[PDB]
Design a protein around this ligand. Structure first.
Ligand SMILES: CC(C)c1nc(CN(C)C(=O)N[C@H](C(=O)N[C@@H](Cc2ccccc2)C[C@H](O)[C@H](Cc2ccccc2)NC(=O)OCc2cncs2)C(C)C)cs1
Ligand code: NA
Ligand code: NA
Lengths: 99, 99
């Protein structure tokens, strides 16, 4: 598919047995998901955005479907106002930026 | 070009006649450049993301070249951690996401 950028590039994702909306974000190294009760072990992490750092929980080998494309990798869970799909997962679904 | 996402999608920009490196960022509504001297009039604004808000200088109708492509639009200047080209200018250069 092709997604234009006139509006936020939001797609449906499936994670943890739940459907959510998330932003395909070429400017994010990592994938940040809103607070959700994922099972199993995690590692504390802090990640930085434009206004400073927040605390998140790092979960590895998490299965996530992005716009119908299966992916598996690390997901950072914490208090974000928007779910962000970063390059660690965008590469797995073969996403490019084109102009 | 077609840009893949195994590395950050950094390109060279020209702004105010000066070369800089910036990130092509589909998860950003706006374009935010590090503190610099820039010709044009500006007004104070705040912009937010992960971590909260920062104070910036809003410059409208600024000429910028992004990887060799021309855009003319709003540039926010302030203490961003990285130079970000957001959707307001990615649309101008005809960028899309594809997978
Ligand atoms: C839900 C609602 C609040 C929203 N508002 C928006 C519109 N807004 C404010 C933004 O687009 N704001 C932008 C932004 O930070 N976007 C973000 C998504 C977001 C949006 C709103 C609230 C929280 C996160 C998404 C952006 O790709 C930023 C860009 C960035 C890159 C490196 C360093 C600093 C920043 N990426 C990150 O947040 O993580 C970046 C990581 C840091 N180092 C490597 S990757 C820019 C202005 C920079 C979208 S959703
Ligand atoms: Na959708
Ligand atoms: Na860095």
């Amino acid at each position: 598919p092709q997604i234009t950028l006139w509006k936020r590039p939001l797609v449906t994702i499936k994670i943890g047995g739940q459907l959510k909306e998330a932003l395909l974000d070429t400017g994010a190294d990592d994938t940040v998901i809103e607070e959700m009760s994922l099972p199993g072990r995690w590692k504390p992490k802090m990640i930085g955005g434009i206004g400073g750092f927040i605390k998140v929980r790092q979960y590895d080998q998490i299965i996530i479907e992005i716009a119908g494309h299966k992916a598996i990798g690390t997901v950072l869970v914490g208090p974000t106002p928007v779910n962000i799909i970063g390059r660690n997962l965008l590469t797995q679904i073969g996403a490019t930026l084109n102009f």
